[model samples]
Target: ASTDYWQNWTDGGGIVNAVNGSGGNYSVNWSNTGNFVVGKGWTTGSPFRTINYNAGVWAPNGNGYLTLYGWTRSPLIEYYVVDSWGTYRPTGTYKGTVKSDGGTYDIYTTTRYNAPSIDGDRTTFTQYWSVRQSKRPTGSNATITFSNHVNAWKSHGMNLGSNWAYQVMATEGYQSSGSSNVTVW
Candidate 1:
């Protein structure tokens, strides 16, 4: 990729090999003081199955984390299933806990007013986070049952509209640094 973003996501200041293997494996390396994410996903979202992935040689420093990231419309919702991290993780009002496939994650709800979003740079939205209680490490093998989180959020009264956007396994950084190699299938 030759710009700030690759197909679905990325906010510059990184090196991303979008398609390295035959099975759509990709990798990203970055060290940025500005916000950034390098990942691979789809243009259209769907009701996902047990999505499987591996973070081979993952190393995130400063402030960063790995997540199943995406956006939905109508209510304008941003969602994350954060499985791993570096120096810091996000904080919000504890909504509840979601027991998904891999483990039980602490649910947090936060709002972003006039912040960056799938619609544009100045859109207000709600963020739903399912952060793992036990942070995982590199060489991590993962199984994310997305529907578990979706239904759980709905049970918590977190509004998620039907309009789906780009869905990716992303490494996100906010004034941080990181590098991750990932394969999704």
Candidate 2:
């Protein structure tokens, strides 16, 4: 994780507090925009805290609304929320809705308390590569399809006609980039 505070070798390893134009300079400080501000000493009144409704001091009452948006894996389910406030008695307008590439959806008073689980949302994927002699299928059915097949028999790992094998031959081959992912629950 990184911080918005300037990283000056002369300063202690801490974020330099910033003052939002709306608040005093020392009272406001830049932080990682990705990090959520939670816990006490932060409130809506201060304009520095996120998740302030959970603290109980600033009941936004009618005008208060919470909205969340981010990338997700669920195509069928437009929105998936994992939790809510104490009452969970969400008002009719407290509908959780999302309109995505697939469709639109909403969550009402469905859960026991409109709050849901926070862990173990499982998803996974894998990838590999191979080779072919021509654009068409080659040697075996495996190569018949448009595929990348690294044949063990043809791979440098094996040396032709020698049991001692080519252990230290300088050869050039294609490399692959890393797999990446993200999840929010």
Candidate 3:
């Protein structure tokens, strides 16, 4: 089965925030002076609501792009931590390129920190893709690709976990202000 997802955020910032709606089409607004994330996804189900997760994906338009940060259980994985974006980090290795929105971006595999979970573990090998030059305007019709990440993972001999959980799209902000409007189809 295929699922399309979208997440939107407005007037959001800091560590405290919230979102509205569910199952792909939704809206969000938040405000903070510390750090926060506001967005949504057409996911298998809310991560907190499901145990046997499946597959899903998302595209977001906002103040900038998504700086996804999270952890996954089962096999244990951390999406990211402090500053490990560029090649300066051992985990920041160029994986490959993905072409979409009439542009190509070099994909890289990296790791970061995941906060401690109730399971008493604090880290995992997380997988994420960055398209620094591919941010499209809010509501603009653009085609973003995920195949690069998929192929890159294959190159590393990594296989998708049994529970392909959580398809998230959101903006990570810190002490920032403004409104962001986005749509996913």
Candidate 4:
């Protein structure tokens, strides 16, 4: 798990107190992006903290979202976004289904949140189908369908253009009274 205070990245080492309580299997500053975080009363209210890209096409085999020891006091949201926040989908809107080791997910396109603070100058949107599981899926071998995403956009008259500036897999928690140990590989 990772935590960010805007541009500042903190893996919740004992120094950066982004989390509370005590737990194991935690690490900090592993990379510019990647972390293993455990928390008690921590919460990320905005959809901002993320590890992203300026642009690229990502298609992973066997469920793309993976985790082990993934426990939570709240719901976990995993998703991919092709953004126009700094760009737009050359392709307009899209909808379809993708298969993974765990199961199939309904893929669709929609606008990000209306909050200008988070969305910024970027406009328009595109996203991969997400698996909103209360607990972890089978394993890391889960697959994601890039073609279905491309087709969904094509159907909406939008081309999966370029300027794909961001992609994030995040865990948003609210009022964590109990400790949570999250280990993502």
Candidate 5:
């Protein structure tokens, strides 16, 4: 494995310490100060939850993205220690108009997806978006093509929220939100 994926990252970038397995890896943020967060996608179940006990020793492997609330948290596959999200309980029915950008659109809402389930205490977490959108700046200073008020999801699939997320100029306005009840324009 290349050093970037396998070599131990001791400290830096608010990263206290990180470890990876071919099947999964776990990292202790602030290595000496923060708690350890297991990185794995649970929305669709873990793709690497079977690598720990094959030989009576724990080992990690491969590359995969773990999503948090419909957003990818990291690019490494970590052991799915347990599942905190409950079983397929129905998502409280979305029964009202979606409010967006301070305006209400006449879009009919639908709860078409099943509730994501996490079976074990520490299984995995993944995110599937029910809706999405984008937006453009209202101000004229506009040094940037797109403001932080608008963005995209599942693009490159990394949870790189608010990091260089921009829009192309001379095209169209950015989207605001998707399936969000707060901003729909």
Candidate 6:
């Protein structure tokens, strides 16, 4: 469990965003305008379909997802293991549900046509989603079993394909304001 990766992104316009951390521990803070995300994890060269995490101080405003987000090639997939969110719970095609980790998660799929991706900004991909039914209590080092969700997703025909890209315990916000702290191991 080596969280040796860090990412900080913003859409511009004097956006205030930053991510600072080392190893498996990281903190992300963002405020005002555009889209912002900051996270720390692994930029694995191969498929890493199974993982786990624990987050502390989860508080967000506006629209965003606190998720284990990443992408996969061969089939071109963007995925999210949504544990919590700010304000609204987003959904897509309502692809059913996957139960595990002592919890139930609703499944959804969204197709992005000529959207931004890890390969390119104009590549199209399918997004796999698993939003938790019970929100994680803040400031607790409670573990979220991401592997179980992936295992369950495959059982339901939502395969992650091959060639795992960089996976992160990330906090992403779109025109949002908030902060998060997490450690993945």
Best by TM-score: 6
lDDT string, candidate 1, 16-74, tens digits: 33344435356766665466665666655555545566888567767777787778887
Q: Give the per-residue lDDT of model 5 (tens digit) for 62-103.
A: 111111111223421211111111111112223233333332
lDDT (Cα, tens digit) per residue for candidate 3, span 125-160: 555454544333344344333343445445655334
Q: How accurate is candidate 5 locally (lDDT)?
A: 0.21
* Model 5 error, position 70 (Å): 4.4
Q: Which runs of model 1 end up more than 4 angstroms from their true locations?
A: 1-22
- Greater TM-score among 3 and 6 belongs to 6
TM-score of model number 5: 0.18
C-alpha TM-score for every candidate: 0.86, 0.16, 0.56, 0.35, 0.18, 0.88
**Predicted structure with the largest lDDT when compared to the true one:** 6
The TM-score of predicted model 6 comes to 0.88
Q: What is the lDDT of candidate 4?
A: 0.27
lDDT of each residue in 100-174, candidate 4, tens digit only: 334444445444443222223343333333332222232232222334434543554435433222222222211
Estimate every model's Cα lDDT from 0 to 1. Answer: 0.71, 0.18, 0.39, 0.27, 0.21, 0.72
lDDT of 3: 0.39
Ten-residue stretch with the least lDDT total in model 1: 1-10
Residue 113 in model 1: lDDT: 90
Any runs in candidate 6 off by more than 4 Å, and if so which? 13-16, 45-50
lDDT of 2 at 73: 20
Displacement of residue 110 (Cα, Å) in model 1 is: 0.9
Superior candidate under TM-score, 4 versus 5:
4
